[PDB]
Amino acid sequence: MFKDGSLIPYLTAGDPDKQSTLNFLLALDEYAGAIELGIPFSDPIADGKTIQESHYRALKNGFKLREAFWIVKEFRRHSSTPIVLMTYYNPIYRAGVRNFLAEAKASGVDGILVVDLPVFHAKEFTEIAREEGIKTVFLAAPNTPAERLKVIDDMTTGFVYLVSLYGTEEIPKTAYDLLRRAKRICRNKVAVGFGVSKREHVVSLLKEGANGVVVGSALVKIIGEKGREATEFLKKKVEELLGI
């Protein structure tokens, strides 16, 4: 869904507010090959400490689901950079799958990632997504075996997203091992969310086969620290990670 060598920012919607989120996106767009926009959820059990707290912040400040389409729609007025919406199933199941996908498609979303999509629903989800024009993005962790990777790659229309809960400040062997394994199997492009935070992390991961590197924790850390004034700080962190 993005160019090879891409840096892919991840931001939580409504952290600290939908307005600041828009500002951050517009500020990082020039460095982004694609963008992941996260929908805060009450029980973000799949996320690491940093991202979990951004979910809490966003919600505390009173974020509401569709406030995410506002961010996208507005962003679209300025950019055409691919946008991937990341969410938990709950919000979508409760709000009607097809209805959500359709609305997202209208707001300008290109692909969706449902962190905890029940395998029991995977198929129907992928089909509805295809009918609504939304590309799919599936996750795989260090404990995802070769056989599951294949099945994941086969249902993926957007790209395969590899993560590492591990954190770091070096990238764990187990994470490199996952990338390596994913490359010998996936036909789709793969992006990695391994909690990078240093230029060597970006250089290394790209060199090792990552089509794109996601950058979330490093950005969300700054945002929870600088609030609405995090903009320029984000630009510098991204430039540092880019070597510019």
UniProtKB/Swiss-Prot annotation:
It catalyses: (1S,2R)-1-C-(indol-3-yl)glycerol 3-phosphate + L-serine = D-glyceraldehyde 3-phosphate + L-tryptophan + H2O. Its EC number is 4.2.1.20. PROSITE patterns: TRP_SYNTHASE_ALPHA. It is an enzyme of class 4 (lyase). GO terms for cellular component: cytosol. One of its GO terms (molecular function) is tryptophan synthase activity. The active site is at E36 (proton acceptor), D47 (proton acceptor). Pathway: Amino-acid biosynthesis; L-tryptophan biosynthesis; L-tryptophan from chorismate: step 5/5. Belongs to the TrpA family. This is Tryptophan synthase alpha chain.
